[PDB]
Structure formats: structure tokens, C-alpha cells
Design a protein around this ligand. Structure first.
Ligand SMILES: CS(=O)(=O)c1ccc(-c2cccn3nc(Nc4ccc(N5CCOCC5)cc4)nc23)cc1
Length: 291
């Protein structure tokens, strides 16, 4: 689980998010083109604040072993702590967001529910470790193959305090406000329940097939009125959600699946379903579609 920098060969950028960046690299210590391809995450700009966060993120990933969670391989200190790299398994199909968009004709509703189910199982497992993901979105879900997705990034994930069911955090800069629960917007409270709200948005995303005009940002902005910007956007979002304004049912989405989304989007934190009950309900719907 210790990787030397000089044996890591850059191939491609895979994405930036929050304050990290991920690259596809070949780890080739024999320098004979026989090493495996791996995903390598690093800080966009190394900083003491971010490095301490990055180290916690690494310990979180390292602590997680689950079919629907991306695998930790090691760390590359090599160029010093300030050039800390996280080495993970490379998943060849990319983000679910991108995959779905590219293969919309091939992916039916039965298949979307398989992915949904797998995402719920990953999240239930996180929950057993009292980890709050804080950034559930299709851009952070990865595709290993046609039958398996994994939660693939943990940049914003926090551990609950021992004595509370929520964690208050406010990081500098841009937050994915259109995936956030109301209490995360108004009070900065994150919880398993806020992750369930976001899971609702993931389910919406999936059933929209990532159609551009249908993304959560684009829908909420239209509902808010596109004649608004800056620090008044979150103010109007809070008001819209407080008055039970919600993302519409996607085109073709069955009502029983939309019901799941709307129940995740309860203003009452305590009435949102559990991840185990979501898996249950999704698997029943899956079966009734199987027949
Ligand atoms: C949300 S992000 O962009 O910060 C990000 C990107 C990648 C990862 C990541 C973490 C751990 C393992 N993997 N494997 C892949 N694979 C992968 C493969 C292809 C593509 N793309 C398809 C070709 O177009 C560009 C991206 C993206 C990711 N990506 C990862 C985590 C977060």
C-alpha cells in the first residue's frame, strides 16, 4: 500500500471535484509496461487545512470494504506529505452520470433500479460506521461494469460525533446546494437523513437520464426564476423548499418511484425513510417489474 511516485505514469485526467483532482495512471515499477492502471487522487492546491482533511478522507476510505464502495489501494507520499496522493482501483466505465448520458438507449428502468439498490447498500454500510457522505450525486458514483456501481468519492464525508445524530459543517466556497436538504442549507446540519434527501436527488437524476435542461440546478433555477444570482439563490431555494416546491416527476418515471423521491424530500428530517427501507422498497418494485 506504498507507491513510489517515479513509477506512476500519467494517462488522463478523470475529474475535479471539491478540492481534489483524479488522474488515470499506470503504476509500473518494473518499467516494462506490465503494471496495472489505477486512479490517483490529489489536492488541486496543497494547503495545511486541506491536507488534514485529505488525510481523514483517506482513513475513511481505507476503513470501508464493500462491493459498492471503490477500493483503496495505498498512498504515495514520495514527493513529500504536501504531494500526498490517494491510490484507488480504476473503474473503467467512468461516472454513472456520464455513463447514463452515453448509454440512455441501453439502460432500462429495471437497470436504473439495480443501480439505485446498490447505491442504497453502500450508503447503509456507511451509516453503520456513522459516516455522513455529504455529496451524494451521480457524478460521484462510478461504474465498474454494466451490473455494478460504486460510491467513488469521499471528499466531503464526515464522522458523526459520538453523542449526536447530526454534524454541523460549513466549508469555504461552493456547495452543491441543489442536492442539499433544507436543514443543511439553513442550519448546516448534516445527517444520515440529509444523505437520504440527496439520495432522492440521485434517484431523480437517474430517471431524467441526465437530460441537460432537466438537471436539479436547471429545474430549481427555473422554479426560483432565472432573474436571480449570487447570495440570493440559496435564500430563494430555502423558501421554495419550505413551501413544498419540489423537482418534478421525470419524463416516464413511474409514480411508485416518484413517491420514493418525494418521501426522501420530506421537510421533517425524522420522517425520511431509512436506507434499509429504501433498498426494500426498490427491490420490491424491481421484482414486480421482473415477473
Ligand atoms: C467526481 S470527480 O470528478 O472528482 C472524480 C473522478 C474520478 C474518481 C475516481 C475515483 C476512484 C476510481 N475511479 N475510477 C474512475 N474512472 C473513470 C474512468 C473514466 C472516466 N471518464 C470517461 C472518459 O471521459 C472522461 C472521464 C472517469 C472516471 N474514476 C475514479 C472520483 C472522483
Amino acid at each position: 500500500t506504498q507507491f513510489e511516485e517515479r513509477h506512476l505514469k500519467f494517462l488522463q485526467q478523470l475529474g475535479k471535484g471539491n478540492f481534489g483532482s483524479v488522474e488515470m495512471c499506470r503504476y509500473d515499477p518494473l518499467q516494462d509496461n506490465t503494471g496495472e492502471v489505477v486512479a490517483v487522487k490529489k489536492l488541486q492546491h496543497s494547503t495545511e487545512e486541506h491536507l488534514r482533511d485529505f488525510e481523514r478522507e483517506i482513513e475513511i476510505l481505507k476503513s470501508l470494504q464493500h462491493d459498492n464502495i471503490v477500493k483503496y489501494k495505498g498512498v504515495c507520499y514520495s514527493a513529500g506529505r504536501r504531494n500526498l496522493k490517494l491510490i484507488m482501483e480504476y473503474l473503467p466505465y467512468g461516472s454513472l452520470r456520464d455513463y447514463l448520458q452515453k448509454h440512455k438507449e441501453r439502460i432500462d428502468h429495471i437497470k436504473l433500479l439495480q443501480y439505485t439498490s446498490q447505491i442504497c447498500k453502500g450508503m447503509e454500510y456507511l451509516g453503520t460506521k456513522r459516516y455522513i457522505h455529504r455529496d451524494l450525486a451521480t457524478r460521484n458514483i462510478l461504474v465498474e461494469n454494466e451490473n455494478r456501481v460504486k460510491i467513488g468519492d469521499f471528499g466531503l464525508t464526515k464522522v458523526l460525533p459520538q453523542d449526536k445524530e447530526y454534524y454541523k459543517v460549513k466549508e469555504p466556497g461552493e456547495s452543491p446546494i441543489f442536492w442539499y436538504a433544507p436543514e443543511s442549507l439553513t442550519e448546516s446540519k448534516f445527517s444520515v437523513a440529509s444523505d437520504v434527501w440527496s439520495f432522492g436527488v440521485v434517484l431523480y437524476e437517474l430517471f431524467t437520464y441526465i437530460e441537460k435542461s432537466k438537471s436539479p440546478p436547471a429545474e430549481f433555477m427555473r422554479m426560483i426564476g432565472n432573474d436571480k444570482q449570487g447570495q440570493m439563490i440559496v435564500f430563494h431555494l430555502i423558501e421554495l423548499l419550505k413551501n413544498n416546491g419540489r423537482l418534478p416527476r421525470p419524463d416516464g418515471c413511474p409514480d411508485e418511484i416518484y413517491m420514493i423521491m418525494t418521501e426522501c424530500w420530506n421537510n421533517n428530517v425524522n420522517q425520511r425513510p431509512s436506507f434499509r427501507d429504501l433498498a426494500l422498497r426498490v427491490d420490491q418494485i424491481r421484482d414486480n417489474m421482473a415477473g
